[PDB]
Amino acid sequence: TQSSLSASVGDRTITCRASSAVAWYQQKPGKAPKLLIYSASSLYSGVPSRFSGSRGTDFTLTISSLQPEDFATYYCQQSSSSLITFGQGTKVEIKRTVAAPSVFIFPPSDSQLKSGTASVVCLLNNFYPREAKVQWKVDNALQSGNSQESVTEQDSKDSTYSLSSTLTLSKADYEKHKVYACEVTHQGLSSPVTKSFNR
Amino acid sequence: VQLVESGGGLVQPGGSLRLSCAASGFNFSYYSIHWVRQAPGKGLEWVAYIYTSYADVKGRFTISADNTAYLQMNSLRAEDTAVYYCARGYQYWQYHASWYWNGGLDYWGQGTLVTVSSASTKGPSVFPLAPSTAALGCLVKDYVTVSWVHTFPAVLQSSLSSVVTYICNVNHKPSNTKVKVEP
Amino acid sequence: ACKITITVVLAVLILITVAGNVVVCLAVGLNRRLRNLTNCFIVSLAITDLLLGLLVLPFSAIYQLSCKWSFGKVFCNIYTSLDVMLCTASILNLFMISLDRYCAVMDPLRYPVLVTPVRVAISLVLIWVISITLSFLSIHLGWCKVQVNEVYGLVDGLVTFYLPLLIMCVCYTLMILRLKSVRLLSSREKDRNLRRITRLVLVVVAVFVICWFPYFTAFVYRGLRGDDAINEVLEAIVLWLGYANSALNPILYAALNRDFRTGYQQLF
Amino acid sequence: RQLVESGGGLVQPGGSLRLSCAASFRLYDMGWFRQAPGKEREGVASITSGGSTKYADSVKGRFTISRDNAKNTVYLQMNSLEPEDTAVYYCNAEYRTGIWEELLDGWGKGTPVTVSS
Ligand SMILES: NC(N)=NC1=[SH]CC(CSCC/C(N)=N/S(N)(=O)=O)=N1
Structure with a gap:
């Protein structure tokens, strides 16, 4: 057992609480994990010296100085009697000032309704950090089990995220109700922000 | 090695x-x-x-x-x-x-x-997200390569949305399916 | 009742001796792999045990079962001379094979130069010439049963069997001591070949000595304490035990060495 | 064995x-090797029954x-241990099962060593 860490370049430590010595791996998005530390304290050949591992019983990985390259997920791998098990893994990321989401609600297009499917999209743009909550209220009634959320990776230029939440309703159900809205709560926002349209 | x-x-x-x-x-x-x-x-x-x-x-x-x-x-x-x-x-x-x-x-x-997956190729449906800076985008559902800007990671339903804050061209290579956004 | 069983046993022994010796000759001659300078002595031994079975053994069988001699003195002298010559022509081939193995083991990398094929031909020719000359110059010129006496009988036991035996024992003791001391002899395959062939020769020699030791002990004793000192059953058990070695050898050759087994399997 | x-x-x-x-039947040679996570097997020392020894540069x-001939036990003393x-x-041991047998080799299961504390 080890979730998310925000740190700027040049800032110094991950922890994977368990007694087989752990090994630490590194993997960037969509690539092959590399080895970093083995036997709980030994640096792999050809690896930058910044990474170091310290053994009480709570093992800790540490990075002395962050670099632009050093931004990825880290994994601990503890042996056992006869089967090994990888840690849940943590993920460093670039610190950046707080920002507030810009909310846009999109009415279902006429053609999509013509097919028979209604989708309502709530778009949050350029909001930092990742944590946010989106709630769907239809006719002043909260809905559950009918929405999906997708989050982008950090932007290269401004290190900001975008979230799209999509509500899927049957065309008949869409016709039944009149008021559709999405409520967004964020750290920056003083109060919940609601955008509403009318069928 | x-x-x-x-x-x-x-x-x-x-x-x-x-x-x-x-x-x-x-x-x-x-x-x-x-x-x-x-x-x-x-x-x-x-x-x-x-x-x-x-x-x-x-x-x-x-x-x-x-x-x-x-x-x-x-x-x-x-x-x-x-x-x-x-x-x-x-x-x-x-x-x-x-x-x-x-x-x-x-x-x-x-x-x-x-x-x-117990599924076979199905046609992607692309729809215009009409602007109700005013953002606009195209949606891709029930299918991907999308060209024109933020493209979201694809989701698996029981779909991906591309928003630009213009012609959106959606190409599905397996099915060879090829598909203007204004107020 | 007993006569039928003994005659069947003797017929079986003659049959095994003849068949085994022809098998060894055919396998060694026919297969190219088994044609080597060490196997020249083995083929000579095969011929020297083939003849004993083809000629000497049937008459010995007849004489033993019937208990009378009838062919006559003229033949009888030929039969005993032939019998004596074949023994002398087997205790010299064993000596030469043991000299071959001593030369190979003790002095490796010089075995090809020293043991030239011409030398092997000279050794075989000399061995047969000495065997025949001694047999017929100690049979025709004097000095059916071998006739023991004061100096001829006593001398043959000591010079023919006992003297080669001690040289062969010294050669084998030294060869075993060096074999144990050394680690690598000559490629790994070459070392294993030398060790396996040395085991083959050592077992054939030990079998020969164990088979023929009782007869020669009796032969010395009959000179020492009189011709009739020992019983007839003891006199005639040893002779057949000695004669069994000729039948026994082909089995040893096949069992000890893989190449013989393969050649025999191909032949039949 | x-x-x-x-x-x-x-x-x-x-x-x-x-x-x-x-x-x-007899033990002729005994050797020591070290294998690291990203490196190949490397010889460190070897000793004969006579007692001749050779060492790697490092x-x-x-x-x-x-070598202890009586008890068939060899040892390696490592000093100035570094990461x-x-x-x-x-x-690793070389041995002959029998006088007429061919020479054979033997491999140990490995003793893991970490120079850290
Ligand atoms: N090589 C040599 N010089 N002498 C001898 S003496 C006996 C011998 C083995 S063959 C003689 C076997 C035989 N006829 N035995 S017996 N009791 O007479 O009927 N070689």
Whole structure:
């Protein structure tokens, strides 16, 4: 057992609480994990010296100085009697000032309704950090089990995220109700922000 | 030292597939070969090593070795879909492994995608997200390559949306399906 | 009742001796792999045990079962001379094979130069010439049963059997001591070949000595304490035990060495 | 026959570990090798029945090998241990089963050593 860490370049430590010595791996998005530390304290050949591992019983990985390259997920791998098990893994990321989401609600297009499917999209743009909550209220009634959320990776230029939440309703159900809205709560926002349209 | 994997492909529930690993540049006798699975959008998971053991996938899975190690999967399920990795370690890692020792897997490959889906090609439907700076975008549903700007990661339904804050051209290579956004 | 069983046993012995010796000759001659300079002595030994069975053994059988001699003195002298010559022509081939093995083991890398094929031909020719000359110059010129006396009988036991035996024992003791001391002899395959062939020769020699030791002990004793000192059953059990070695040798050759077994399997 | 290896433990830098290999017709040679996670097997020392010894360049001046003929036990004494010496040190023995038998080789299971504390 080890979730998310925000740190700027040049800032110094991950922890994977368990007694087989752990090994630490590194993997960037969509690539092959590399080895970093083995036997709980030994640096792999050809690896930058910044990474170091310290053994009480709570093992800790540490990075002395962050670099632009050093931004990825880290994994601990503890042996056992006869089967090994990888840690849940943590993920460093670039610190950046707080920002507030810009909310846009999109009415279902006429053609999509013509097919028979209604989708309502709530778009949050350029909001930092990742944590946010989106709630769907239809006719002043909260809905559950009918929405999906997708989050982008950090932007290269401004290190900001975008979230799209999509509500899927049957065309008949869409016709039944009149008021559709999405409520967004964020750290920056003083109060919940609601955008509403009318069928 | 080079490790390669093959045998990853589309499968259906209850199916069986066998994956082989290529070993080159080293003496096979002194090493153990491990198979590691990373489910899409999830953490690393260990399946087995090839002296054989299995994760508590026990029974359903079989492992064997010939300089090639083979993993056989039976009664496949939806959860099995993932990217599979082949790694190299010490021969007696279990005997060697101790409170002070853990060798680790020094060399890794590139991974192979095993997709278990009971489905066939279906046509993507692209719809204009009319602007009700005013953002606008196109939606892709029930299908991907989208060209014109933020494109969201694809989602798996029981779809991806592209928003620009203009012509959106959506190309699905498997089905050869090719599809102006204004107020 | 007993006569039928003994005659069947003697017929079986003659049959095994003849068949085994022809098998060894055919396998060694026919197969190219088994043609080597060490196997020249083995083929000579095969001929020297083939003749004993083809000629000497049937008359000895007749004489033993019937208990009378009828062919006559003229033949009888030929039969005893022939019998004596074949023994002298087997205790010299064993000496030469043991000299071959001592030369190979003790002095490796010089075995090809020293043991030239012409030398092997000279050794075989000399061995047969000495055997025949001694047999017929100690049979025609004097000095059916071999006639023991004061100096001829006593001298033959000591000079023919006992003297070669001690040289062969010294050669084998030294060869075993060096074999144990050394680690690598000559490629790994070459070392294993030398060791296996040395085992083959040592077992054939030990079998020969164990088979023929009782007869020669009796032969010395009859000179020492009188011709009739020992019983008839003891006198005639040893002779047949000695004669059995000729039948026994082919089995040893096949069992000890893989190449003989393969050649025999191919032949039949 | 089984080669039993021992003397493997976690050692602080600069420490010393004396290893011991026990073999249960004749034993001709015994060798030591080290295999690291990203490196190939490397010879460190070898000793004959006579007692002649040869050493690798890195090992030289710190490692010594000696043979006990009576009990068929060899040992390696490592001094000036440094993090580069982290490896699984494997024992190796050459032997003959019988007088007429061919020479054969034997491999140990490995004793893991970590120069850290
Ligand atoms: N080589 C040589 N110089 N002498 C001898 S003496 C006996 C011998 C073995 S063949 C004689 C076997 C035989 N007829 N025995 S017996 N009791 O007379 O009927 N070689």
